[PDB]
Amino acid sequence: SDYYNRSTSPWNLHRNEDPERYPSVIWEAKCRHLGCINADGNVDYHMNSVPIQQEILVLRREPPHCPNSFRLEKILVSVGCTCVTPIVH
Amino acid sequence: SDYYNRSTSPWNLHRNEDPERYPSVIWEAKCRHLGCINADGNVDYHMNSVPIQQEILVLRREPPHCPNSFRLEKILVSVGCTCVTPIVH
Amino acid sequence: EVQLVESGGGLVQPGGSLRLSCAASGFTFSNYWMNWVRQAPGKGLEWVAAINQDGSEKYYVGSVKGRFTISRDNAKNSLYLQMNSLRVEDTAVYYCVRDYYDILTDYYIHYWYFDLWGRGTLVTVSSASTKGPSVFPLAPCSRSTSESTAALGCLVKDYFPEPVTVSWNSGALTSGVHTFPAVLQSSGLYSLSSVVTVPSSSLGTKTYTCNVDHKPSNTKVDKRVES
Amino acid sequence: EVQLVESGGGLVQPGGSLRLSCAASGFTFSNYWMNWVRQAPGKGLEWVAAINQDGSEKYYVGSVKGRFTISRDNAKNSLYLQMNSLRVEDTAVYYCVRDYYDILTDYYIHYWYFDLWGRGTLVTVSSASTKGPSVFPLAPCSRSTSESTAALGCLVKDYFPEPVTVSWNSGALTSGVHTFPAVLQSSGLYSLSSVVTVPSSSLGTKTYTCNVDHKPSNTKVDKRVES
Amino acid sequence: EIVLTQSPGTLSLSPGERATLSCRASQSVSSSYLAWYQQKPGQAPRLLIYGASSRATGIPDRFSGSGSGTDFTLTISRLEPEDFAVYYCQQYGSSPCTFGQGTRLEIKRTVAAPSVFIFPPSDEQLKSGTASVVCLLNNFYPREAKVQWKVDNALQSGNSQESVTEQDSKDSTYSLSSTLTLSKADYEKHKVYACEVTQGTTSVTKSFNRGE
Amino acid sequence: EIVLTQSPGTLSLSPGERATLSCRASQSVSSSYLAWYQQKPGQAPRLLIYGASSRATGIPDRFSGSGSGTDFTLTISRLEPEDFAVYYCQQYGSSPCTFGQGTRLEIKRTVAAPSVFIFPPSDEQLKSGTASVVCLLNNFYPREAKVQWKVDNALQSGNSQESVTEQDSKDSTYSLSSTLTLSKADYEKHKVYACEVTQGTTSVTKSFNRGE
Questions:
Q1: Half-sphere exposure of C97 toward its Cβ, with a 13 Å CA cutoff?
Q2: Chain A partners within 8 Å of D36 (Cβ)
Q3: How far is the first Cα of chain A from the last one, in angstroms, to the nearest whole number?
Q4: What is the dotted CATH code of the domain comprising F115-209?
Q5: F115 partner at 20 to 30 Å CA-CA among A20, C127, C198, D165?
């Protein structure tokens, strides 16, 4: 979905694959601005764009260079920005 | 992080584990309101709270009731809401 | 051939409900965002609600919070507006509209402007009951002498809701006929006038009849104005 | 003992830079959100910036967009404000403040109010060079007769920036001494007055000296007022 | 919420002339996302200009768009009869989308005096306890005109309502209905009912005596 | 952005009395997230009330908080000398946090007339080409007073500046410096310099002749 471009806190996606890291298809979400884009399309700095991060499971060989069964490692990946305020409403 | 409560588009989390589904620790993010909470703490309905969804890998036995190696199935999970507008800024 | 057909208007009491329906003929409905834009009789244009391609998103004007509900049916190629707890200020002509979209590469770009509109339906929110029109003849104090060009008319007083359609001599008399926009009296009922100016030599030969058609009340008054 | 100590004030030219520092003594700094709140000489309180516990979030007032930068160092228990391209309107006393937090269950609740403040530093943005004060004696046209209670003073004219500290007879004369707030002249320089009203019988016995201390210019004027 | 103010409220020009329409925004309209719509009485709006300067599909060359930020202009260089309608501007750069209050483009022509007619109420309505005196002002220009009822010479106020037709397709004039509304008991106590129309210097007065 | 307006601009009351301070919000302040701060001249603010009605740690019982939505009140029931300071309200329900412009609580007492003194410029300053005539208004009440310089009887304007002390810790009066500022060439052409103070009916005038 095109939420990345139409959100108040828009984000850009950055694909990656380290020599041993699997899967290859992982687009890391990075916030466009410090502030948020108000209804008038301007950036307001009394609000902040923050990336929502998810703890999940990714494929990794140990010992390396193996095309079989092994133990999978940890992965910390931001998947989308949101607009926060210092106030708990 | 407490972004879920301090975001303009706040969300509630809903934990689950189906009889065969693994891992047990999966909190599904659900949006609190249709509209977004403006700077003044009010809901504005010319903006919408949308859940950011992530396509990822989850543990599943086939044939069922097996504590060994098998093929893992598909999982569609919303991890956090964001505030959208019909305008592409 | 690409069209939008509204339906669902009509008189409602303060506190009531209505459901407007819009038939989107001649184009692939699923591709566009749709909106409801209202216009109070005489006043300007005002956005009411908006809806995503699949209904994933529903945007609303502040005044209609939890009272109105936009909805669609891409299979039945239709758009609907559920109007609950209607207030008098909701009296307006509602238009369903199509939102211009563009495609730069493989990305859909929605723009909040309306390249296609419908004919719109009139929603009236009032306590006044439906009243058929009391039709009267507009005739000079006395035919004799007066002038060479006589005026003749129909006073369509105390009707509700709108509209009436006036016609002269079963629509044969079209030339120099003036049907005036209706004015809402202090009683909450409309009154209006249709006038015709004919050669005063024609009176005593030709008869002059006006055809007041009030479809909201299935009333039809056919009145003969005599000098 | 829980304190906040600002430093980094001082005269700056229009277009300049400064970095305010705030030492947060007597409490675990990492637990609180911090803010910079300014107060123009005489005017009211105004929020400048805010900062998250770890600096993950930096909030700013519209007027300081891309000119000011809040930052912290939980290890060096300090808060900083990087003030770039300073405009005259930035002239103010800046306070660093601690944001009240609560804990209901296992959830930290930040509130945007300030349970602890610092002494604040004065930032002056002007083109005027530092000028030491020209100190003059305020004495009655003639001692003789005049009255029984004489007034004596010091006119501290044409100094920049602020502040001066006036004292009488090495701070021995405190009773019935009035040092007036400074007024910024049309030249962009401050002038002020310190006055003392002494029994006119004391003149000709006691000497009266005022101690004008201008620390921004390391000047110190000690003036003897003679009747 | 962006507030669009259009100037003038109504513009009287003659075909061949250049119409210059203004839309002033209360705040800077993002990426010059401004549209202009045309609206003829009884019909539904039509898109003309998008992105402040781009002409929509089918729109003739004579329609022009200008503007950026807060001030936006719509220009129709050489006016044609089918261009005389109401004009709304709409912004789509700020949420929610807001429209201008409108500016109607009227067909300015030679002054014409109405052909004033006064119709008394009917004996049909009289038995229903109410009297209605209508005055018609037939085919006139410009729209402005002042009707003032007079009953036994006394000037009336608070007891009248009027309505005006749209601009005539052929002669570009205006017609005007005016209704005085009294009780049967009232009407039956006075003999002179006069409808007084005033255009500029002139003051035409059609009338009748109750018993005539 | 919520705009907090406090009333009055300044409040003159005597210890023992009840002070009633007002904070009016331009918009409804979320979950009554309103704080009140006290500020004595030269010192930094101090938190008094939070959540519109709750007293902060250490704050005495005499301090009271009331309000919800747009109207908020701070009340000090039985005034003590240490309560006479500036008072700001601050909201933390809308982003960004905004403060009230302030309301100072002044120690209202018996009227006192100043002890007017006029000091001429020194011959030290005279050689520097500038003349400065200072008038002091020693210990007076209330703050309001009108000084008006007079040179060779002619009333002066546009050439003076004044300053007022804070309220005296002991006697609750006010002192006032006033400076006339002329060229040496000007001063050297006139003989009478008068400083005129006006409190209510009375108009005290201290003066001097240039050659005295």
A1: 26
A2: none
A3: 28
A4: 2.60.40.10
A5: D165
Q: In chain E, what residues touch C112 (CB-CB under 8 Å)?
A: 33, 92, 95, 97
Q: Write out chain F residues lying below 8 Å of A87, CB-based.
A: 30, 33, 92-95
Q: Tell me how long chain C is.
A: 227
Q: Among 2.10.90.10, 3.30.420.340, 2.60.40.1090, 2.30.40.10, what is the CATH number of A3-84?
A: 2.10.90.10
Architecture of domain E4-107: Sandwich (2.60)
Q: Write the CB contacts of E112 (distance below 8 Å, at least 6 apart in sequence).
A: E139, E140, E141, E171, E173
Tokens of C193: 């006038």
Instruction: DSSP letter for B50, please.
Output: E
Q: Are F55 and F37 in contact (CB under 8 A)?
A: no
Task: State the nearest Cα–Cα gap between B13 and chain F, in angstroms.
Answer: 24
Rounded CA separation F119/F135 (Å): 6
Q: Do D118 and F163 touch (CB under 8 A)?
A: no
Q: How far is the C-alpha of A24 from the C-alpha of A60, rounded, in Å? A: 11
Largest Cα–Cα distance in chain A?
54
B76 with B26: CB under 8 angstroms?
no
DSSP 3-state assignment of C68? strand
**Is it true that the peptide bond before E60 is cis, omega within 30 degrees of 0?**
no
Question: Which residue's structure tokens are 């980094």?
Answer: D8
Residues of A in contact with E97 (CB under 8 A): none
Q: Which residue of A has its CA nearest to B2?
A: A88
E93–B85 C-beta distance less than 8 A = no
CA distance F149 to F157: 8
AA identity, residue B88: V
DSSP symbols for E156-192: P-SSEEEEEPPPPTTT--EEEEEEEEEEHHHHTT--E
Residues with Cβ < 8 Å from F154, sequence gap 6 or more? none
Give every CB contact of residue F75 below 8 A, 6+ residues apart in sequence.
F18, F19, F20, F21, F63, F64, F65, F66
Neighbours of B74 (CB within 10 A): 9
Residue D71, burial from CB neighbour count under 10 angstroms (0-12, 13-18, 19+): middle
Residues of chain E with CATH 2.60.40.10: 4-107, 115-209
Closest C-alpha among D123, D225, D134, D224 to residue D185: D134
Contact yes or no for E93 and B87 at CB 8 A: yes
Q: Report the SS3 class of residue D201.
A: coil
DSSP letter string over A19-71? Answer: TT-B-S--EEEEES-SSEE-TTS-EETTSEEEEEEEEEEEB--SSSS-SS---
Strands E10-13 and E103-107: parallel
Q: State whether D114 and F47 contact (CB < 8 Å).
A: yes
Task: Give me the phi and psi of D62, to 5 degrees please.
Answer: -50, -45
Q: Exposure of C105 by Cβ count < 10 A (0-12 exposed, 13-18 middle, 19+ buried)?
A: exposed
Phi, psi for residue F125 in degrees, rounded to 5:
-70, -35
Q: How many Å lie between the alpha carbon of D75 and the closest alpha carbon of chain A?
A: 23
CA atoms of D34 and E141, how far apart (whole Å): 71
In the block, which residue shows the tokens 């005279």? F126
Q: What is the resolution of this structure in A?
A: 3.0
Q: How far is CA C184 from CA A37, C14, C157, C168, F103, in A?
A: 46, 18, 10, 23, 53
Sequence-ordered strand ranges (E) for chain E: 4-7, 10-13, 19-29, 34-39, 46-50, 54-55, 63-76, 86-91, 98-99, 103-107, 115-119, 130-140, 146-151, 154-155, 160-164, 174-183, 192-199, 202-209
Cβ partners under 8 Å of residue D76, min gap 6: none
Helix (H) or strand (E) holding C80: strand C78-83
